[PDB]
Amino acid sequence: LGKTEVFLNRFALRPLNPEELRPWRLEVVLDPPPGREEVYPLLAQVARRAGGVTVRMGDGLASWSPPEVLVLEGTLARMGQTYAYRLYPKGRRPLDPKDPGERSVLSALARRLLQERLRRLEGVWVEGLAVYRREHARGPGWRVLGGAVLDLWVSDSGAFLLEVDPAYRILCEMSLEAWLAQGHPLPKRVRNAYDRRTWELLRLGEEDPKELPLPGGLSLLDYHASKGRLQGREGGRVAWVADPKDPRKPIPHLTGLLVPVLTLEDLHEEEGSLALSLPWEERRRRTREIASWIGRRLGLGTPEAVRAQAYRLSIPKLMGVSKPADALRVGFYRAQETALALLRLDGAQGWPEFLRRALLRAFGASGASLRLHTLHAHPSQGLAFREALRKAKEEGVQAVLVLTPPMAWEDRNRLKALLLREGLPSQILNVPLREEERHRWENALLGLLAKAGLQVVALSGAYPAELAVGFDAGGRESFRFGGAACAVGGDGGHLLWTLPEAQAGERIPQEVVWDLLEETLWAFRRKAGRLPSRVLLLRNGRVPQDEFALALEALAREGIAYDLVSVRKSGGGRVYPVQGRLADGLYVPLEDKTFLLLTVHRDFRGTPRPLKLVHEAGDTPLEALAHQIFHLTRLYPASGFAFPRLPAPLHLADRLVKEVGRLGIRHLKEVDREKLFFV
Amino acid sequence: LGKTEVFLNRFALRPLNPEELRPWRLEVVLDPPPGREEVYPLLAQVARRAGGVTVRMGDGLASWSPPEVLVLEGTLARMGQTYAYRLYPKGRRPLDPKDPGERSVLSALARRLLQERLRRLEGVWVEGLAVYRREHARGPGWRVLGGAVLDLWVSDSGAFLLEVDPAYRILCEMSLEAWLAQGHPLPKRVRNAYDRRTWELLRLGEEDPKELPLPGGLSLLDYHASKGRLQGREGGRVAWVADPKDPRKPIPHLTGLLVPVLTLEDLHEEEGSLALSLPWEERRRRTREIASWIGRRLGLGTPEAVRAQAYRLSIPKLMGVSKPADALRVGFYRAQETALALLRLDGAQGWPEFLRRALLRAFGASGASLRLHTLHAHPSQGLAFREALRKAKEEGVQAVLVLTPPMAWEDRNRLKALLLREGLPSQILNVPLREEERHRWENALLGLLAKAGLQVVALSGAYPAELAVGFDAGGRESFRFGGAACAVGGDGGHLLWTLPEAQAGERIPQEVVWDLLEETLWAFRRKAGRLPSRVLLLRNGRVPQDEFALALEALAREGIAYDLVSVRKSGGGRVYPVQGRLADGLYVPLEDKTFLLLTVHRDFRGTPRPLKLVHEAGDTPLEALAHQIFHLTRLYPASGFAFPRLPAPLHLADRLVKEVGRLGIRHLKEVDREKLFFV
DNA sequence: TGAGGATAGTAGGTTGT
DNA sequence: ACAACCTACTACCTCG
DNA sequence: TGAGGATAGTAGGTTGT
DNA sequence: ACAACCTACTACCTCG
Ligand SMILES: [Mg+2]
Ligand SMILES: [Mg+2]
Known part of the structure; x- marks a missing residue:
């Protein structure tokens, strides 16, 4: 495809002198000894009370500060029991930077080194690992101060690494x-x-x-x-x-x-509008600056902005299109004879002429017959809604629209709960509404339209997978929801979801995770006629150890290939063009089976936050993953002009769980998995 | 109705002298003061380090021991932050026994008094409030020492109250x-x-x-x-x-x-496998005995066994029948044209023609046609099961039967997960069954046939409600499932269930609580042709405050009457006949609006554990509630000879959540609410 | 409840040494 | 603790 | 995976002052 | 803490 080199916010610092490689280690002994459940935190508490630049290492502590300045004896309360600890120093033993676990100690040693150094400067605001040295703007009451978040870790090369991202902070001091x-x-x-x-x-x-x-x-x-x-x-x-x-x-x-x-x-x-959001050219300008200011303070040598090669992914075309909204009036990738209904309590209203026209223009371009209808709603007793559903059942209903004064969530869901019982998907445009803000009706419908399949655009590119499925956890903080969405077809995609299941944690039961992926394999041959040669395994967030183990084996037994990738929003730093403008779609290799991927960026929203991706399993090339993965971003149909950063199965997936965790799943029998009911 | 008097395990004790009404109170001051999250537990930790006979009293402790013997200063660690506390005495001030909260303190004072007295006697084994004075049975390795569990609380009357239940303990002293x-x-x-x-x-x-x-x-x-x-x-x-x-x-x-x-x-x-379960006439004999032994040790005078008036409830004429097994040969209250299927991996080749005969005869005495089909299943790919359910769907699968070598739970649930996917209820009997021993097959299928929807029996009695619904929280320990089951007709019963929804706690959301009851109100008039004039509101366990508030209001709004009752399995009572033999169905009014109800008892399975019941809301008589409640005990189809202790909606409900909690909820779309799939 | 992102901001959770 | 990730709110922003 | 209950036993959780 | 209640396992028991 194509290529450009990118700067990274990471910086290159001094190779570690020997006296850093060899930290003093101190063996901990404490009374009463603690059962293994309490041992790792008791040690960390020891690392902090001992003081100095010390961190836990195994069953002992390592320390860059000599024992002669550490507090070797004292007391700590953890849980209920109170302990006294002693430390018995030892001459320092070098640590292997290649060994992950020993560099984990030289990383933590570096975090606590950098942090100690930050307190000692003034007059600066320090908030953990974040420092704030300048003053963005002043108000009589307030000021907002500025700077970046930092991190100082040790690489495999045995050199100090520096990470800078500028961030702002607001300071009110008035009463x-x-x-x-x-x-x-x-x-x-x-x-x-x-x-x-x-x-x-x-x-x-x-x-x-x-x-x-x-x-x-x-x-x-x-x-x-x-x-x-x-x-x-x-x-x-x-x-x-x-x-x-x-x-x-x-x-x-x-x-x-x-x-x-x-x-x-x-x-x-x-x-007015204060640009806390930084424009990429200024962000990248502050990062370089601030890192110099650290390095001039730190004494770890001058930073050399680390650069990575990068490659521009082939633009993905939705089709009938440059934005899905452009598609709304004209022909969809697919269209089906369809019915829709209106219900609300202004009250009360009539369907206006303008909405119909847009539907007609698009049906007219594509060539599919369009219906529309009306409904009338009684909410105090609520009985009729079912009677409607039977009339709504035929012909047709495939999605429904409502408008009311905006409701308190407690009232909003309770109406969405009573809405679903009879098998109705729903969408709201708070009213009153005007032709004055077009987008609030254009996308509020573009979501209704996918809410009956489909307002879809599907790719035309050539991709190694021909089925994509998404998994995540969402719902109440107390326990989570594992659910999944799916993308049908190598060239021409389709969108559908899987009922989620309640678990106590982020981990998705292996038995379920395969069960849902299986439920999307039934989907491919539902019209596909054959088993998909290769399937695409993405995961929202980290992938738990062997949560897919059942799932990947059970693919192999049934004869289907696969690739597995971790998608995490949070990790992965920032990516700046070493020369020239910035571009909406990118792949950077980094190291081994992990790559960064920039799904979305506008010149006006600020600096984009790029995805970090690891190739956990599968054989396909990294670039191939980016090539499908990037295109996958576009297919979302309830955003007429904005492209989620997560490809639709994950994004659709994120919505599915969260709505499911706010709504519940009790009444969701009648609803089709064709509906895409969350949006 | 009928009438007999009953003893209770509680005992009349001394009216409290004044020096017990007037405890010393000590005000607590602690550095640092705690946030209100930690104030009640810190004071309890205070009452415990203070020593003596002391308990928390709101802002400060109360104490039956004079300050002069209490430890008024010390340290305490809670949640990792240590505190010093001081106590300042304030004379003494009488406490009202009518006030629940001040009797709560005098009850707590009584608990800790009894406990302090128990330690000081020997050689008894004391385990909290449980005491063990005599040796039931000796082995060379072991002993099984015996005695009772006690509790000593303060009445509204102002006299000490003693509750004794004999319990045993196994103590093995050898390597x-x-x-x-x-x-x-x-x-x-x-x-x-x-x-x-x-x-x-x-x-x-x-x-x-x-x-x-x-x-x-x-x-x-x-x-x-x-x-x-x-x-x-x-x-x-x-x-x-x-x-x-x-x-x-x-x-x-x-x-x-x-x-x-x-x-x-x-x-x-x-x-010789001696069973710790006592016979009611010995357990009764021990209770009186043991209380005397306590009483002669305590110095609160002599206990007088408290008696309560009691009444004999209606005997259900379940129909029709004396045992639902009796029903199996004869006509079911509701025979319906029906089908069954068969699959197993033992693998027995074939249906064995002794089971068929029983099915035919009951459908041949009632007058209802029946069929029994056959199935063959491949577990390596499992694809076929999908083709079976389509064959199975028409017309044969009302419910299913399997038989298999004993399955680990991992494999047992994983197969049941597969079972549901195609909307397939199921019932196992392990291999190898032997016709000779009938009960495992006679009940194994009484479970499979209610899993088809025949209501084996229903009452003939006259009851003030015509619709009964049950609610419980069940599921994994971390988070719970709320579900409901119901009984369709007061004169003639029906059994069906409601999907469950996932919550973080024992409280069921008012918006779900009412939504379920509404789903059983929607059900009643599917064939009732009216709103049920009165509905029955039972709860498993305690009723959280105002969980039902939305639900009961929404009843009264839609024209339906109601009565509300709390059913507590571990609600405290033991009931003994002052004269004569013990009997299966009983009602005792307790002084409060609550009553005890004995749903089941067998002369051979020990002393029965009676239910405590409060009339929480509504207007029907206690006797009337019991009178309906006791019959609902029997409706449960799935036990051939033994009647659950909870009436079938609650019991069905307990089973409903539990299976949902281990099986899941996600697969179960196709299955009918007709099925009664758990058993 | 208008969509998406990226800013601060609140108030947290899980996983895995 | 701790790290690297997730969770679900509100409130700016402009419409590939 | 046979049904229920009542025994001991394990290893816990929620609700509400 | 604490109370009075719940949760879900296993392992006797005999068949209203
Ligand atoms: Mg948004
Ligand atoms: Mg049992």
């Missing part, structure tokens, strides 16, 4: 009554002047704090005064705050002692 | 090598001689402990000798134990230092 005093609206949240605890503001209130009632038989002005908060400051106006953990019940508070906590929505009254 | 020495099979589990930790036993290889190799530069024999456990014992034969938490991989160990942990399976070789 709540002064911030209000400039006629600015109340902040979403708010913090005690005297401490960390953060409230959530509700209303200003009227009462006189000298006269207000407290359960204590004390007064608001008095209670705070007793506790001595208001020697520095004067309380003034009475605020009503409420705890985020439990919003009920409102708790009284004096504004003079609350501090607003600002966001861009509070900052934008004072600064 | 693993000697217990094997008497030619007895290896216990399922085993414990360290030198400590609490217990292992799970596996095998004992031939390795010679003097030369077996430890992961360290050590040897099994030499290892334990290093730690000096061998001073009082000899190691002898090598054992191979395995950790329960992670069974792989086997861990080596010396039998001379392990101790078998015996159950009634291991005592049964020695003791």
Whole structure:
């Protein structure tokens, strides 16, 4: 295909002198000894109380600072039991940089080296591994300061590596009554002047704090005064705050002692649009700069921006198209005779003429007969909705649209719960709505359309796989949801999903994971007529150890090839063009069976965040994976102009679980897996 | 109805003297003060380090011991942050016994008083609030010492209340090598001689402990000798134990230092398998006895066994019948034209024509046609099962039957996962069945036939509700499943179930709770032709506060009456007939709106465990609820001779969640709610 | 509930030595 | 602890 | 994987002051 | 903690 070289935010630092290679090690002995469950954290707690630049190593600690300056004896409380530890030093033994586990110690030694160095400079703001040396913009109340997040680790080469990404931070120092005093609206949240605890503001209130009632038989002005908060400051106006953990019940508070906590929505009254989002040319300009400023401070030598070769993936064409929205009026890759319905409580309304026209123009271009219909909804008793479903059943229903005043989630889901029971997919455009914002109706329908298959574009390129499936965990924080979406066809794709299953954790049961992948193998021969030669195995996030083991074997037994790749948004740094403009689609090899892949980038959203991908299993070339993987990004049909960063099975998959974890799956029998009901 | 009086295991004790009403209270002050997350547990830790007879009382402790003997200053570590506490006494102040919260403290005071008294007597075995004074049965290795579980609480009346239930304990004092020495099979589990930790036993290889190799530069024999456990014992034969938490991989160990942990399976070789379950007339005899022995030790005067008035409930004329097995030969309350299929991997070639005969006759006495088809299944590819369900679907598969060599749970569930995928209920009987021993086949299929939807029996009685629904939380330990089952007609019963939904806790979402009850209200009038005038609201376990609030309101809105009751398996009672024989069905009003209900009892399976029931909401009489409740006990089809203790919606529900919790929910799309697939 | 991303921001979780 | 990843909210932004 | 219950036994969890 | 309740295993038992 094609090629360009890319800078990376990583930097090249000094090769490690010997006295770093050889850390003093200290054997830990502690009373009472701890059962293995508590041992790794007890040691880390020891690494911090011992002090110095020390980190746990195995059943002992390693330390770049000599034992003569470490606190070798003391006490620590972990869980309930309280322990005393002692440390018995030993002469230092070199550590192998090739050995992962010993470089894990020289990496941690490097993290804690860099961090110790950061405290000792002033006047700088340091927040863990993030440093903030400059001042982006100033307001009377506030300032926002600037800098980057750092990391200093050790490579296999035995040299120090530096990672820089610029990040900003907002600093409000005014009280709540002064911030209000400039006629600015109340902040979403708010913090005690005297401490960390953060409230959530509700209303200003009227009462006189000298006269207000407290359960204590004390007064608001008095209670705070007793506790001595208001020697520095004067309380003034009475605020009503409420705890985020439990919003009920409102708790009284004096504004003079609350501090607003600002966001861009509070900052934008004072600064219009403040570019916290950095344009790639400036981000890359700050990264190089700041890294020099570290290196001039650190003494690890001058950094040489690490460069990686890179390759431009072939542009992927949706078809009938440059953006799916362009496709909406004209012919879809596929079209089917279809029916749709309208129901809502403005109330009440009629279907307007403009919506139909768009549907007609597209049906007209493609050549497929279009229907539309009406429905009328009673929500207080709710009985009819089923009766509708039977009438909605024929002919036809394949997706449904609603518009109402926007609802509180508790009300929004409860209506989405009652919606699904009768087997209806649904989409909302909050109203009132106008032709004035076209996009809110163009994409709110483009989602309804996929909500009856399909508004699809499918690739025309040549790809080694001919079936793609996506897996992730989503849903309540307490336990997760494993589900899966799928892409049918090597050249002409199709979109469908699999009911997810409840597990206690991120790990997906091996037995299930294969079961769903199997459920997508049934799909290929549903019309494909044969077993797909090769299937594509992506994973959202990390891939757990051998979670696929059952699944990949069971492919081989049934005669199907495969490749397995990890997709993680979080890892993988940043990618800058060594010369020239930036480009929307890229592959960088990096090392071995891992590569970075840039699925999306616009000149105006800021610097793009590139995917890190490892080839976990399978034989196909990395470039081949990128070549399909990049094109896969485009196929999403509920985004008329924006392309998810995750290819649709993962992205579709992300939606599927999250909606499933907010909605539930109780009522989802009647709904088809043709629907693509989440969007 | 009918009438008899009953004793209760509770005992009348002394009215509290004043010096017990008036406990000393101590106010707590602790540095640092804790957030309210940690305040109740920190105070309890305080009441425990303070010593004496002390318990938490809100902001401060309360104490039956004078401060002058309490430890008023010390340290305590909770959650990894240590605290010093001080206590300041404040005279004493009487506590109201009518106030629940102050009697909660006097109840706690009573608990810790009883417990402090139990330690000070000898030679008794005391295990928390459980005490063991006499020796039931001796083996050369073991003893099974006996006694009762107690509790001592304060009444609204102001007098101490005593609850006694006799319980036994098995204490084995001898090493693993000697217990094997008497030619007895290896216990399922085993414990360290030198400590609490217990292992799970596996095998004992031939390795010679003097030369077996430890992961360290050590040897099994030499290892334990290093730690000096061998001073009082000899190691002898090598054992191979395995950790329960992670069974792989086997861990080596010396039998001379392990101790078998015996159950009634291991005592049964020695003791003619004596069953710890007492006969009701001995257990009753022990309760009175033991309470006297306590009472003569306690100094609260003499206990008077508390009696409660009691009434005999209606005997269900299940139809029609005396036992649902009786129904099997005769006509079912609802025979329907029906089909069955057969598959197995034993593999027996064929259907054996003794089972068929029984099926035909009942369908030939009722007058209902029937068929039994055949199936053949390939498990290596499994594709065919899909072709079977299409054949099976028409017209033969109402329910299915398999028989297979005993399956590990991993393999057992994995096959049942496959079973559902094609919407196939299933029932196993292991190979090898022998016709001669009927019950395993007679009930194995009474489970398969209700898995077709015949309702074997229904009552003839007159009941105030005409629809009964059951709710429980069931599933994995980490997160729970909420499901519901129901009974269609008061006069004539039907059995069906509702899909379950996944939650993080015992609380079932009001929005789901009502949604399910609504799904059983939708069901009733599928053929009822009316709204049910009254519906029955039972709950498994406690009813969380206001879980039902949305549900009960939404009833009253749609014109339906209701009554609400809490059913607690472990709700506390034991009931004894003051005179005469014990009987199967009973109702006792307790002073509160709650009542005890004895759903099942057999003269041979021990003292029965009666149900505690509160009337939470509604207006029907307690007797009426019991009167319906006790009959619903029997409706369960799937037990040929034995009647569940929970009425079938609750019981069916428990089974419903549990299978869902291990099987899953994802495969089960096709299966009908008709099926009753779990059993 | 309009879509996507990338900014700060909240308040966390799991996996695996 | 800890690392490298995930979770699910709100609130800027402009429309390949 | 035979049904239920009641015995001991394991190894825990939730809810609500 | 703590209480009063639940959870899901195995292993006796005999067939309302
Ligand atoms: Mg978005
Ligand atoms: Mg049983």
